Amino acid sequence: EAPNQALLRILKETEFKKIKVLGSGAFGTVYKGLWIPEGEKVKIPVAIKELREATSPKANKEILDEAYVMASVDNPHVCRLLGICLTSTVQLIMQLMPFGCLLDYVREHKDNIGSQYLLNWCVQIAKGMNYLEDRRLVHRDLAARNVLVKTPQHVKITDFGRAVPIKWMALESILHRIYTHQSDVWSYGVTVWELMTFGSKPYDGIPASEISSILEKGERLPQPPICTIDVYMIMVKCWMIDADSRPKFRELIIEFSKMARDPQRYLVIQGDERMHLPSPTDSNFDMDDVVDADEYLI
Ligand SMILES: CC1(C)OCc2c(Nc3n[nH]c4c(Cl)cccc34)nc(-c3cn[nH]c3)nc21
């Protein structure tokens, strides 16, 4: 097939500064930083990832496989790699998404998330997913935790650089380890459910081993209180046994876009209209010569 002509950018350690830790886990440590190129008179807000501390040959392999996938994509609703740093332990550089992941965002800002935002996010996620489809790239781990927030009005898919989350998996994935663009549609349905419930845990309390039987019986995730039969029907469609019967991401873009034009007709949120999230007003944004990675291209 088509040669992958993507450019792998190597960044000098002296060109970027680590400000603070955003998160620390099994993957290692993620830092909030600033990338100051050569003498370009620009300061790019970045996120720097590093393999904890130790350097084992197999760990570097796994982080370079992520760099490969991340550098191979370019879409407004998909997270991209800015570059790699070849220190003792390899470092991944990517654009800073100041509001963190969507799952934490909806849990922490539920009292100000209106129907417009929820529906716009659904369009945005489907658009990224449709790009991943056009590029023949299957996510395998789509969930609200794997959707980063640039601005509350702009979200981007991440962690597709995996190519077990049973409660987000399609039936063919659990039983036969089948991962397709249609199995990502099921995971998308669970992601929408996560947003609509304002970050609730799917099948909370129920063990992972029982999920297979629950799904095979015909039981699915409940109708979120704010969901009209219109939105919920779409979620239900994503959770069908027949993968070809499930909607396509281009169908999901259209359907959610139709709904986003009259958001109060499709999502009933009490207190909606009087709700507002941080937007480019007063204090949305050193801080001199700062430019976003989306506007900086060499
Ligand atoms: C702390 C939290 C929310 O958890 C983990 C993680 C993460 N993981 C990454 N995955 N891939 C990355 C690359 Cl290539 C570079 C830098 C970070 C990552 N990335 C971010 C992030 C923030 N702004 N932009 C990316 N945030 C998080």
What is the H/E order?
A: EEEHEEHHEEHHHHHH
Q: End-to-end distance, in Å?
A: 28 Å
CATH class of the largest domain: Mainly Alpha
Helical/strand content category: alpha+beta
What name does the CATH topology of the largest domain carry?
Transferase(Phosphotransferase), domain 1
CATH architectural label of the largest domain: Orthogonal Bundle
Can you describe this structure?
The structure is a monomer. The protein has helices at 57-71, 102-109, 115-134, 171-176, 181-196, 211-217, 229-238, 249-260, 263-266, and strands spanning 16-24, 29-35, 44-50, 81-85, 91-95, 147-151, 154-157. It folds into two domains: 1-96, Phosphorylase Kinase, domain 1, CATH 3.30.200.20; 97-283, Transferase(Phosphotransferase), domain 1. It is built from nine helices and seven strands; from the N terminus they run E-E-E-H-E-E-H-H-E-E-H-H-H-H-H-H. By secondary structure, it is α+β, with helices and mostly antiparallel strands. A five-stranded antiparallel β-sheet has the order 1-2-3-5-4, with helices on one face. A two-stranded antiparallel sheet has the order 6-7. A hairpin with a 2-residue loop joins strand 6 and strand 7 (154-157). Helix content is 33%, strand content 14%. Helix 3 packs antiparallel against helix 8 and helix 5 packs antiparallel against helix 7 (229-238). The structure holds the ligand CC1(C)OCc2c(Nc3n[nH]c4c(Cl)cccc34)nc(-c3cn[nH]c3)nc21. Residues 22-23, 30, 47-49, 66, 70, 81, 92, 94, 96-97, 100-101, 148, 158 line the site of ligand 5N3. It is classed as transferase/transferase inhibitor. Keywords: protein kinase, inhibitor, TRANSFERASE-TRANSFERASE INHIBITOR complex. The assembly is monomeric. EGFR kinase (T790M/L858R) with inhibitor compound 15: ~{N}-(7-chloranyl-1~{H}-indazol-3-yl)-7,7-dimethyl-2-(1~{H}-pyrazol-4-yl)-5~{H}-furo[3,4-d]pyrimidin-4-amine. The protein: Epidermal growth factor receptor.
